[PDB]
Design a protein around this nucleic acid. Structure first.
Ligand SMILES: [K+]
Ligand SMILES: [K+]
Ligand SMILES: [K+]
Ligand SMILES: [Mg+2]
Ligand SMILES: [Mg+2]
Ligand SMILES: [Mg+2]
Ligand SMILES: [Mg+2]
Ligand SMILES: [Mg+2]
Ligand SMILES: [Mg+2]
Ligand SMILES: [Mg+2]
Ligand SMILES: [Mg+2]
Ligand SMILES: [Mg+2]
Ligand SMILES: [Mg+2]
Ligand SMILES: [Mg+2]
Ligand SMILES: [Mg+2]
Ligand SMILES: [Mg+2]
Ligand SMILES: [Mg+2]
Ligand SMILES: [Mg+2]
Ligand SMILES: [Mg+2]
Ligand SMILES: [Mg+2]
Ligand SMILES: [Mg+2]
Ligand SMILES: [Mg+2]
Ligand SMILES: [Mg+2]
Ligand SMILES: [Mg+2]
Ligand SMILES: [Mg+2]
Ligand SMILES: [Zn+2]
Lengths: 24, 80, 127, 206, 60, 125, 155, 98
RNA sequence: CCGGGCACUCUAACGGGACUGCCCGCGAAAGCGGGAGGAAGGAGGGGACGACGUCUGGUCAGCAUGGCCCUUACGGCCUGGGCGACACACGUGCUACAAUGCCCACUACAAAGCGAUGCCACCCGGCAACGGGGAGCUAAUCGCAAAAAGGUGGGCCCAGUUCGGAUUGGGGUCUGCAACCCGACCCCAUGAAGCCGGAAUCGCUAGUAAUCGCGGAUCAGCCAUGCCGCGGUGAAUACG
């Protein structure tokens, strides 16, 4: 969930981007 | 998960005091207030007394510890 | 030739243009069902027409902006209801009782200070 | 502790600002720090003139300004010898080169800031508080005003136990956002310590 | 405000980091609003006096 | 089949199944099925001996896994520990190592709460 | 509610069966204001009932509700030191509130993985006269009268 | 094509600078595009009322920056005069990107 | 997108608008109960605003201030520590224990805000953090910007498990003179407790609760899960 750093919703919550949530 | 980037940091207080002290060879003791500085190759063999805020702890530097900051051998707090 | 209302809800603006025709409904250049894809509520948006036997005697071009889809659905609900009266003011005699003419005033209440969410107060202990 | 400053509360209507100069997120803090430096000096000296207000307008290095006093002369000086030194004291403070008009306070007993200053002085000279208050309310109430009130803090009369003397007449509706009530606060150092003085004058409603 | 630690105006921090806002009016160092240079307390004091132009009491 | 040291992922998608290996996670899993071209969705029970070989081949020679990994990691900790190193001491004292508050919740590294007598009057709240 | 008498708020009829009673059940099913998801669940249920049953789901829904309504219940009241379970009638309004609430609660106690199946099967076992819902209804009524000795404390 | 930008803190101080520029130009230039509103930019300052603790009080303050546009087409020389030195507002700032 | 037009939507100034006025019923009156028009009734909904006073309440560490005390140190400058300690106890919260769910795709619909020594479109390199390079913006023109929940599709099948992400090993990117004590952020490993919580106890009456995400102040960076705001979806129940 929101606490999973390396996941979709995880990056959102932590307000970041990366492999699991790229900037499109 | 350590980090610093490209440009290993080391205060030049002891640096120009060590690499320079390597001219005659080695020496007994040193006294620094730079926990900040990284331990580099040219220190192995030296005995750098580090300050922990109250004391100047004598830290013998070895090969296996090249890379760690000096503060890591001068523990700040005192528990039991 | 063409009739038009408006309708707004919870901060959703709806531009409703009714023109005689089949029963096609365009919402932002999209089939009604295209925009409100799988939203059980949607059906509602056109309730006013059915409230007077229109729908199968009209066609509608709809614009929308601001808010969320269900809010937009409520706005559209009013536009269609308004224009449907500009068309024939005798239609109020039926849409009134169903309150289709009313603009729901309910809006997100302001977030007060010292209070997690406007009303939800902080939990306290050892009192 | 309750009740907002009746001025900060009435800025919307019945009560304009004391600095009508616009600015942007880069200079505002400066033009502000400036006004204060201004009021800092103006008050540090013109005390004797009895300065009720001090507006400050701007447009671009042409810092309008003004100073509403009860006794203009004190500002001016022999022909204008004081209003000179000071006028240069402004541009020496801030190389802005600005005006320095002077409005006269028709009645110094309808300007809360003065009425406060008034009583505040008496307190230091050791006048009986209750009297001063009673009186002050009168001066204000006699020369017009649909209402008025005065409040002194504590250690009244050098007492160890801080108190709070009252006194007020007519109307002073603070909850009514339209009262147009001048508020004035005057400190009051003393051998034994500070005493705060607030003054309220209700003049005209709508 | 310990009129000695009001050496913030120093501008010679050796390293731009050590630079810290600090109130211009109180010396208050813990709630200094960039925009006003004031602390939350004085920012509230002057605003009441109408001495902060434009600054009104918000309500909605 | 057994890929890494006696590993037996089975009856479940190979990618998921590969996870049951010490050293492999969603990433290295998906990656190996990639560089070995095997549909991840296939149940290992439906894998091919041909495939099971390429997998076994790749994975085993390309990464330090299972026991060999624990050995290394074991080693590491013991190193910063054999050295004066602050980080080492923390490991010895069994306390957090990544600079965390030990005044409260530090349970995961400490274990169960070994409660002791306290000072009643003085709302410890 | 110390002043007025908080009047019951009316709900918007069903977007399908045009039934208020249905929106209600949907509201109970709904969690975290996800009224869409709520709606779908209920409907797939009316569908699953169409399947295993050659009867209109709306009629099954009703029947079910009816069987889970408690016409009597016990209410606690302190009198003379101790508290006594006083049985008393149950207003129509509360019966409905209770019936629907229990259906969803009982349904979510069920073993089927899919939400829709649960409401469906619970709704059926309900109109049949069985199911966890109807039990609650019965365990309640059994509770009442089982204390008829105190029925004179009308309340 | 005269671009006129009016900003301020008072919405009368600006409307009193969009009037001293709306008629004093309709006698030398285009029929002019009336003063155009333009959304405001509000800046909120939320402060804890008291000096010590009591973090649940707080009062709300704000700086509302109103805007105006105007935009008079056809400089016409004669317009650039009726609007040369004929204003009044002190709590205003003007901009021209014609 | 261009011509072109202010209709519409907005933007934002100024006005209109609701008065128990109108109708029936009760009443001495005030007013109560309905009914009609109306976007809106009978305080429309939410703020700002909190009397004489009480707690001898908070705050001399925001400031101001009487007295008292130190005035080569109870002042001052640095470097390094500390405020981050950890057997243990409590408060407020965060993330969870999962299928009305979690993933990955792909597609929608916000509102208020912020943006020179800055937002940073777009392009290239890098799994990525981020680094090169650069368009436009002193912003209703450009940018932060994707809103998320939803919707379509597909995977997982009920397991401490595609639930949950705590710890810990490793490799890095940034901000900064400098990240040991003591920074966020990325990637690979690791994958803890937790299967819904004893006695107790908290919030909330509707766009409220619950739930979803977005922006701000402070600020280099950040330990924001705090705080102050914004909008999406949107209940239950109140006998008494
Ligand atoms: K109102
Ligand atoms: K006291
Ligand atoms: K959640
Ligand atoms: Mg997960
Ligand atoms: Mg729907
Ligand atoms: Mg909300
Ligand atoms: Mg001081
Ligand atoms: Mg700083
Ligand atoms: Mg500042
Ligand atoms: Mg694994
Ligand atoms: Mg610690
Ligand atoms: Mg009032
Ligand atoms: Mg106390
Ligand atoms: Mg006390
Ligand atoms: Mg602390
Ligand atoms: Mg807790
Ligand atoms: Mg790339
Ligand atoms: Mg377990
Ligand atoms: Mg897992
Ligand atoms: Mg650090
Ligand atoms: Mg389970
Ligand atoms: Mg925020
Ligand atoms: Mg920040
Ligand atoms: Mg930390
Ligand atoms: Mg944060
Ligand atoms: Zn201050």
């Amino acid at each position: 969930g929101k606490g999973d750093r390396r996941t979709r919703r995880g990056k959102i919550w932590r307000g970041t981007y990366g492999k699991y949530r790229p900037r499109k | 998960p350590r980090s610093l980037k490209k440009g290993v940091f080391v205060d030049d207080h002891l640096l120009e005091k060590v690499l320079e002290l390597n001219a005659k060879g080695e020496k007994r003791l040193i006294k620094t207030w730079s926990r900040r500085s990284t331990i580099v190759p040219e220190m192995v063999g030296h005995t750098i007394a580090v300050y922990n805020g109250k004391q100047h702890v004598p830290v013998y530097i070895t090969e296996n510890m090249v890379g760690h900051k000096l503060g890591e051998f001068a523990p700040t707090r005192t528990y039991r | 030739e063409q009739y038009y209302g408006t309708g707004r809800r919870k901060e959703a603006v709806a531009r409703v243009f009714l023109r005689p025709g089949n029963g096609k409904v365009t919402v932002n250049g999209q089939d009604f069902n295209e925009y409100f894809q799988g939203l059980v509520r949607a059906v509602a948006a056109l309730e006013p027409l059915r409230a007077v036997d229109a729908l199968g005697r009209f066609d509608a071009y709809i614009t929308v902006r601001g808010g969320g889809k269900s809010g937009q659905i409520d706005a559209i609900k009013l536009g269609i209801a308004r224009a449907l009266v500009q068309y024939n003011p005798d239609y109020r005699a039926k849409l009134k009782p169903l309150g289709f003419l009313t603009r729901d005033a309910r809006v997100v209440e302001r977030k007060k200070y010292g209070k997690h969410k406007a009303r939800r107060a902080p939990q306290y202990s050892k009192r | 502790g309750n009740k907002i400053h009746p001025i900060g509360f009435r800025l919307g209507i019945t009560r304009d600002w004391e600095s009508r100069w616009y600015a942007g997120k880069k200079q505002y803090r400066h033009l502000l720090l400036e006004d204060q430096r201004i009021r800092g000096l103006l008050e540090k000296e013109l005390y004797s003139a009895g300065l009720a207000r001090v507006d400050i307008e701007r447009a671009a290095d042409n810092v309008a300004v003004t100073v509403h006093v009860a006794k203009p002369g004190v500002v001016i000086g022999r022909g204008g010898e004081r209003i000179r030194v000071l006028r240069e004291e402004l541009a020496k403070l801030t190389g802005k080169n600005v005006a320095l008009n002077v409005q006269e306070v028709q009645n110094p007993n309808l300007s809360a800031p003065l009425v406060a200053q008034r009583v505040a002085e008496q307190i230091e000279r050791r006048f009986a508080v209750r009297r001063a208050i009673k009186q002050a309310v009168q001066r204000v109430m006699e020369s017009g005003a649909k209402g008025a009130k005065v409040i002194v803090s504590g250690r009244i009369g050098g007492a160890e136990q801080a108190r709070t003397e009252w006194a007020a007449q007519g109307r002073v509706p603070l909850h009514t956002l339209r009262a147009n009530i001048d508020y004035g606060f005057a400190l009051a150092r003393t051998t034994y310590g500070v005493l705060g003085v607030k003054a309220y004058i209700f003049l005209g409603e709508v | 405000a310990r009129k000695a630690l009001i050496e913030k105006a120093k501008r010679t921090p050796k390293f731009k980091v050590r630079a810290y806002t600090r109130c211009v009016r109180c010396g208050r160092a813990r709630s200094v609003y960039r925009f006003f240079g004031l602390c939350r307390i004085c920012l509230r004091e002057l605003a009441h006096k109408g001495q902060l132009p434009g600054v009104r009491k918000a309500s909605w | 089949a057994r890929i890494a040291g006696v590993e037996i992922p089975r009856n479940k998608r190979v990618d998921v199944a590969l996870t049951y290996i010490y050293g492999i996670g969603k990433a290295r899993a998906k990656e190996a099925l990639e560089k070995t071209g095997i549909n991840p969705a296939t149940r290992v029970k439906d894998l091919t001996e041909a495939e099971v070989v390429r997998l076994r081949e790749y994975v085993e020679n390309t990464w330090k896994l299972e026991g060999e990994l624990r050995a290394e990691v074991a080693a590491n900790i013991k190193r910063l520990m054999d050295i004066g190193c602050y980080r080492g001491l923390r490991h010895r004292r069994g306390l957090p190592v990544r600079g965390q508050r030990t005044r409260t919740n530090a349970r995961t590294r400490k274990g169960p709460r070994k409660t002791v007598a306290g000072k009643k009057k003085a709302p410890r709240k | 509610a110390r002043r007025r008498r908080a009047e019951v708020r009316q709900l918007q009829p069903d977007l399908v069966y045009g039934d208020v009673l249905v929106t209600a059940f949907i509201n109970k099913i709904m969690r975290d204001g996800k009224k869409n998801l709520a709606a779908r669940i209920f409907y797939d249920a009316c569908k699953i009932i169409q399947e295993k049953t050659g009867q209109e789901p709306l009629k099954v829904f009703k029947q079910a509700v009816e069987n889970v309504k408690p016409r009597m219940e016990v209410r606690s009241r302190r009198v003379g030191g101790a508290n006594y379970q006083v049985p008393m009638e149950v207003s129509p309004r509360r019966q409905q509130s209770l019936a629907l609430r229990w259906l969803v609660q009982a349904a979510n106690q069920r073993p089927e993985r899919r939400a829709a199946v649960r409401i469906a099967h619970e709704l059926m076992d309900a109109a049949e006269g069985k199911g966890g819902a109807v039990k609650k209804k019965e365990d309640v009524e059994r509770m009442a009268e089982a204390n008829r000795a105190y029925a004179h404390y009308r309340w | 094509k005269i671009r006129i930008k009016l900003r301020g803190f008072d919405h009368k101080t600006l409307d009193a600078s969009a009037q001293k520029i709306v008629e004093a130009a309709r006698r030398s230039g285009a029929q002019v595009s009336g003063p155009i509103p333009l959304p405001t930019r509000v800046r909120r300052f939320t402060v804890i009322r008291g000096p010590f603790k009591h973090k649940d009080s707080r009062e709300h303050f704000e700086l509302r920056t109103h805007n105006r546009l105007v935009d008079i087409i056809n400089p016409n020389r004669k317009t650039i005069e009726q609007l040369m030195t004929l204003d009044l507002p002190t709590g205003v700032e003007i901009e021209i990107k014609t």
